[PDB]
């Protein structure tokens, strides 16, 4: 007898036993599938899918640019980017007609967002391409470096604190004749001409790719507008959560089936768009943004249109380069992509030879010019808006025929449902939807899509079967220690189990097993094994002494070697409060001593909250609230901690700055000096500071004021 788990599908339907079709529970330990060859392949494919468009040379960057808009209509089923401007404008017009006033309300909300936004928003992104360092850097560091360079170049609008002023500075810099970059090593100066700076500001480092700080704000505003548009569409799967997706799937299925007559025939397509990024054109986004922002203040239109304009002239960096190895002398060397333009083609294989030959004409200064197409994770919501417009174009008042379609679109994925009197009607509807998508520049992956009678389908890993919906967009989440500290980790683990039980259909027995495994992992990670156990750990002696000392062992925390009192009953209760009544008086006092040297609190945003998304956990500040040790070159800032060093020493003057965002008219130094003087006066009056100290403090305050005035 040969065991075959797949045979379990002969009795249990696949949708019911879909868990067995997912190999891993967590991130796999390879995280591969990217490289320079991949970037060159994407560039080549994107240019090929629109090769029949019009070629031009940029007047600023002198880069080849391909415009497939209004190009020849496709003649085959291969992916294409020949979107028609009139067709997309008509789709937007009909979307507005079916949802009157949507564009105006979304524009007003986005105007509100634009006026009230702040620069530090840009610090909330992921790793970003710093053009000043010309490599990947953290979002906050990249923003600080760009601000420093702009200041050194006499651009200080961003000092107003508004992101829109930072964008004005970015545009002015794009209009600068020369840019100076100073790296502190000592010191070092470099000069960039207009073309070089423009190319640098119009790059997308590939590692998928990441933009520089010069496009983050414009993209943010465009995505805010697209989010506002999508929030008012019931056919949009973005950006709702896991609880609001099952409802939409069930509602659409019921609407397309129950409303169907006894002679009506309904079918459902589970569909993936083949590329959805290499055929989406920035010109189309510009056209649809221009239509959306009709009859709006000119500044708002300009701000929203800068993003697609900037992306239409983007550049893609080719990455690290290539690795060459020799067998005779076992010699290895690295060839940066910068020299890849001025090298022969005898070291690369046939496929690599073809890639380099194709991509050579498109590269300038080591960056391939990529006008057509897009990249995933950038304009997801605008693409969702376009897909929903196509979906809404399926109403019986637009098809003018018996067949009609409706469904859901989530960025790349979609679920369609076509109702028609007979099979030929369903075929006609599917063909019409496909052809309209092609006209608007959307390609459906024929290999990754399939149709069947309505009742069963899939959408973004949510599997629907006869009303039963199984959510597998994200499988079993990590059930180990998050890695903050003992108290935070315990609270996070129990809260995660509770939330999964509430929302993600986690069963009672599965929840108990998850709790057991989490407790085992917690004990092994933090060496807090039960005090009575004989496992040998560096922490075993102290835990055993504490165990023997205590009277009520049930009150000891798991981190203190106590028992686990958690069950399905009390997953919502913090452990410290759960066993508060069982604690010994002295142990409770020691654990909850506010003067202990371990507890620490950062700004309130990081208080009882962990970033994974961010989840808030309930915990009591105890001795177990310690911090793990911190772990850790060209540089624009001589002192990279100047901002933190200034913000610190302000919380010692005004502690409320930790909890509340301060507001004041005076400058930081003046406020600090005034507070110092007042505190010194009050302390000297109380009689716990002597003449010498007081006069000394008054003398530093005077010299600080003199320095600030000078």
């Amino acid at each position: 007898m040969d065991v075959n788990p797949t045979l379990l599908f002969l009795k249990v339907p696949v949708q019911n036993a879909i868990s067995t079709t997912f190999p891993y529970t967590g991130d796999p330990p390879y995280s591969h599938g990217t490289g320079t060859g991949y970037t060159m392949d994407t560039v080549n494919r994107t240019h090929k899918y629109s090769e029949k468009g019009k070629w031009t040379t940029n007047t600023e960057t002198g880069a080849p640019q391909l415009n497939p808009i209004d190009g020849p209509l496709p003649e085959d089923n291969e992916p294409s980017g020949y979107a028609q401007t009139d067709c997309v404008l008509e789709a937007m017009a009909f979307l507005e007609e079916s949802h009157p006033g949507i564009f105006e309300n979304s524009c007003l909300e986005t105007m509100e967002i634009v006026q009230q936004t702040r620069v530090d928003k840009l610090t909330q992104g992921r790793q970003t391409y710093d053009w000043t360092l010309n490599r990947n850097q953290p979002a906050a560091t990249a923003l600080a470096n760009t601000i420093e360079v702009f200041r050194s170049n006499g651009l200080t609008a961003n000092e107003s604190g508004r992101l829109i002023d930072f964008l004005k500075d970015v545009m002015d810099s794009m209009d600068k004749e020369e840019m100076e970059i100073t790296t502190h090593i000592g010191k070092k100066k470099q000069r960039l001409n207009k073309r070089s700076y423009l190319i640098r500001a119009l790059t997308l480092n590939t590692m998928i790719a990441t933009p520089g700080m010069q496009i983050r704000g414009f993209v943010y505003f465009v995505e805010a507008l697209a989010r506002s548009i999508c929030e008012k569409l019931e056919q949009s799967g973005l950006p709702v959560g896991g609880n609001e997706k099952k409802a939409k799937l069930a509602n659409v299925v019921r609407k397309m089936m129950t409303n169907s007559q006894d002679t009506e025939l309904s079918f459902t397509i589970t569909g993936d768009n083949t590329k959805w990024n290499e055929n989406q054109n920035p010109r189309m986004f510009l056209a649809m943004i221009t239509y959306i922002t009709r009859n709006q203040p000119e500044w708002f239109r300009n701000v929203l249109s800068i993003a697609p304009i900037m992306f239409s002239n983007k550049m893609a960096r080719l990455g690290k380069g290539y690795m060459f190895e020799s067998k005779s002398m076992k010699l290895r060397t690295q060839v940066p992509a910068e020299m890849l333009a001025n090298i022969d083609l005898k070291y690369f294989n046939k496929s690599t030879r073809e890639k380099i030959e194709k991509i050579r004409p498109l590269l300038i200064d080591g960056t391939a010019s990529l006008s057509p197409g897009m990249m995933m994770g950038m304009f997801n919501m605008l693409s969702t808006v376009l897909g929903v417009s196509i979906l809404n174009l399926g109403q019986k008042k637009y098809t003018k025929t018996t067949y009609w379609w409706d469904g859901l679109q989530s960025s790349d994925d979609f679920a369609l449902i076509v109702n028609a009197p007979n099979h030929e009607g369903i075929q006609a509807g599917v063909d019409r939807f496909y052809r309209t998508c092609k006209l608007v520049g959307i390609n459906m992956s024929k290999k990754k899509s399939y149709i069947n009678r309505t009742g069963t389908f899939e959408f973004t890993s949510f599997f629907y079967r006869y009303g039963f919906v199984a959510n597998f967009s994200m499988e079993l989440p990590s059930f180990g220690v998050s890695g903050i500290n003992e108290s935070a980790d315990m609270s996070v683990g129990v809260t995660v189990i509770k939330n999964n039980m509430i929302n993600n259909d986690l069963g009672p027995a599965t929840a108990q097993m998850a709790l057991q495994l989490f407790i085992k992992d917690y004990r092994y990670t933090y060496r807090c094994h039960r005090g009575d156990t004989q496992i040998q750990t560096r922490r075993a002696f102290e835990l055993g002494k504490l165990w023997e000392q205590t009277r009520s062992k049930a009150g000891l925390l798991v981190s203190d070697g106590g028992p686990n009192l958690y069950n399905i009953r009390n997953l919502h209760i913090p452990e410290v409060c759960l066993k508060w009544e069982l604690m010994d008086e002295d142990y409770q006092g020691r654990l909850c001593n506010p003067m202990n040297p371990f507890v620490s609190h950062k700004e309130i945003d990081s208080v009882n909250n962990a970033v994974v998304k961010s989840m808030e956990y309930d915990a009591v500040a105890t001795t177990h609230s310690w911090i793990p040790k911190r772990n850790r070159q060209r540089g624009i800032l001589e002192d990279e901690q100047m901002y933190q060093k200034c913000c610190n020493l302000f919380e010692k003057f005004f502690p409320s700055s930790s909890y509340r965002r301060p507001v004041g008219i005076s400058s930081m130094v003046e406020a600090m000096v005034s507070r110092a003087r007042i505190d010194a006066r009050i302390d000297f009056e109380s009689g716990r500071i002597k003449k010498e100290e007081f006069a000394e403090i008054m003398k530093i305050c005077s010299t600080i004021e003199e320095l600030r005035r000078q």
Binding site: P74, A91, P297, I309, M444
Partner: protein
Amino acid sequence: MEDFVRQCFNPMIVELAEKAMKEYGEDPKIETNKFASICTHLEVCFMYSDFHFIDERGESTIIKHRFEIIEGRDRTMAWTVVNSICNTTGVEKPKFLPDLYDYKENRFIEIGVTRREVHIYYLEKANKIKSEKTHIHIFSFTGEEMATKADYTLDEESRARIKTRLFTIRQEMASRGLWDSFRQSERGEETIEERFEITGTMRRLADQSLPPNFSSLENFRAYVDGFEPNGCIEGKLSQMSKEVNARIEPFLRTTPRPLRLPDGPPCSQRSKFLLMDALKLSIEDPSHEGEGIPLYDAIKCMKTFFGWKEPNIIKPHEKGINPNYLLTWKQVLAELQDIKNEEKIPRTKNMKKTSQLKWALGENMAPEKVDFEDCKDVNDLKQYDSDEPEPRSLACWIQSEFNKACELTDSSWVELDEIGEDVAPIEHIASMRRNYFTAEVSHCRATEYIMKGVYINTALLNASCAAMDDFQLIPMISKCITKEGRRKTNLYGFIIKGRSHLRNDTDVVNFVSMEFSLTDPRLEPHKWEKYCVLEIGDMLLRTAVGQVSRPMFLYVRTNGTSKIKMKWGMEMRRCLLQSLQQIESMIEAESSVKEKDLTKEFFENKSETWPIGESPKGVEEGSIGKVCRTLLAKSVFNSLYASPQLEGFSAESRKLLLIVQALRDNLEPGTFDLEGLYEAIEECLINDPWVLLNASWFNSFLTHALR
């Protein structure tokens, strides 16, 4: 901003500002800075006039209004009232409209609320409007104020109220992130709408980012503004060729075909430790001095075995130096004997660096790094070999491995922690279900693999952190509970860890694993292409005919592991969770159908069966326990044999599974590019034994389900 203005200002003041701005045909919803400016000006006007009266003697008394408002009315009414005042009191006609008329001083006073410095605003007002016999009072949101001749008409109290109101408005605007725009929007005496213009380089870029038939962004904007939908989509659809279509090809019973497995030499073992060939030397009760520490337990386990003989190579490593592995084993034995005779066994044993160990651990075996320009002309230089990996044919050893992993062992391998006492009835139900699953799964061989991997990877990570630059010797140990309930400690082999100067989570630490076994490699040499196998001893095995001698071999190989891989290995216990989740989902579905708890009717039934295997007779059915063990083994083997091929195959074959399921439901499934789906599925089958076995399983399932 608009919400703050509406919710902060007195509703009548809001209405006055609305009407005043409508008089000029301006939209508050689109120009909120001007709206707020007018609201603030009107509020200051009212507070200036408010709480003032004139007594019977003409003196000023605080309770005829002392001040007459002029800026809160239409142009016509304001002009009429100012003319009436001038005629009645004979005052000079002001050149520009004043704000308030002071009866007590019989003059015209104008008030200016300035976001910027007070002196600048006062100078601008003096040089702009002030001509003669007009008083100016300039207020600021920072508390400052100014007036002509420093003669402030009001008492200190009223000015204090105005200053407090302005300061509070400033603070609330700042806290709401509106003060920046409000202050930046003041230019001398007027509030200007926000400006964001495209010029210079950005203008040229915009003009270069339009459809083919456009030259200027303004022209494109004009075209879009006047665009009206006139059957454009219908015309374009009627124009494009009919060859662009999505034709549904039916998928009924004959379209599917078996997946094509790759052809080539049979696949070999790539797991980090032996799975079904593992032999363990066991101590039935570790009650010795210094027990618990791995080294002492390993020494005791080795002592229990008598029959070590002179090692020799049985299966050489084709690409490796067998004498180095032989000398490594000899060095391990020598060091173990040395520590045994020392009588001072330390907690950790660091191996002495040796040529054999230096080579085996790959210490300094790497090409030197040089610049390209220095070695560009080398004839033998070439790009790093990244060709198509050699396809391998499926072998029956992986199926046998999976079969073994699915069957019970004689002893338990899991001792999960405790939880709080059950109180709710649902808690009791969950406990019963979990205990049933645990009983079905406690003794499984997959559980043994889970514990083995967890222990090995935990030891490896701890050693790598503790001993960065030492050749540590790490015994491969596991703990078990026999049927009799006595703790048993099993030793499978040894791992020598090399340099562990790990900085990132992907850099590899290289180790050498030598594992005891009873299986002869020569039976399946292709399975052991990466192993060097030496015969290390002789063992006595019990059978119906007494004791029989069997050679005992040592499988020695070199492997590498990163921090991420070690964490993945240590987290192997989640396979239990996965299997339990599936088994519990089945039970809950059945209970929902039957509206009652069916844990007993699922686990104690021992009569209901699920198809779980295939035999020459046909499909084989097993109890719920067999299904639990099969799913656990599948999860464990997925964890052990993780690869990009596995995830790709799973993702691609899920679509085929769902299409087949739709067929089985008589839902008339149809495809568009089914051949493309087949190609995508088959591109992920190259050499991995696990993926090939999964593909064979899928083929068998297709064969059985289609019928």
